[PDB]
DNA sequence: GCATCCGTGAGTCGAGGGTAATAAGCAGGGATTCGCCCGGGTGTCAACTCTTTTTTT
């Protein structure tokens, strides 16, 4: 996207996705096998 | 006649409950679609006349 805009006479924080990460970050908390429901059923199972 | 490489298989019933990311712009002309309104066919009622089964004479 760097090449469309003109670089002399402007600044940051225009020339950067809002969200080109943040969704990658998101998806892997919420679908992931590693990641996985809480068993909260006891204080043994929190621990184990 | 053998050596190398590409398809099928994997039990069965039950739980658990929804998901998620990129992102030009404006000018011409038609097809589409929502508001109002006249309207003619469908209902809902005042209100004028034959028949007759007794109930009265």
Same mark, same amino acid.
């Given at each position: 996207? +760097? /090449?469309?805009? &003109? $670089? &002399?006479?402007? +600044?940051?924080? &225009? #020339? $950067?996705?809002?969200?080109?990460?943040?969704?990658?970050?998101?998806? *892997? *908390?919420? /679908?992931? =096998? #590693?990641? =996985? *429901? +809480? &068993? =909260?059923?006891?204080? #043994? /199972?929190?621990?184990?």
């Amino acid at each position: 996207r +760097m /090449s469309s805009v &003109d $670089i &002399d006479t402007v +600044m940051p924080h &225009d #020339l $950067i996705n809002a969200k080109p990460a943040a969704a990658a970050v998101r998806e *892997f *908390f919420g /679908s992931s =096998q #590693l990641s =996985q *429901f +809480m &068993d =909260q059923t006891n204080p #043994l /199972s929190e621990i184990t």
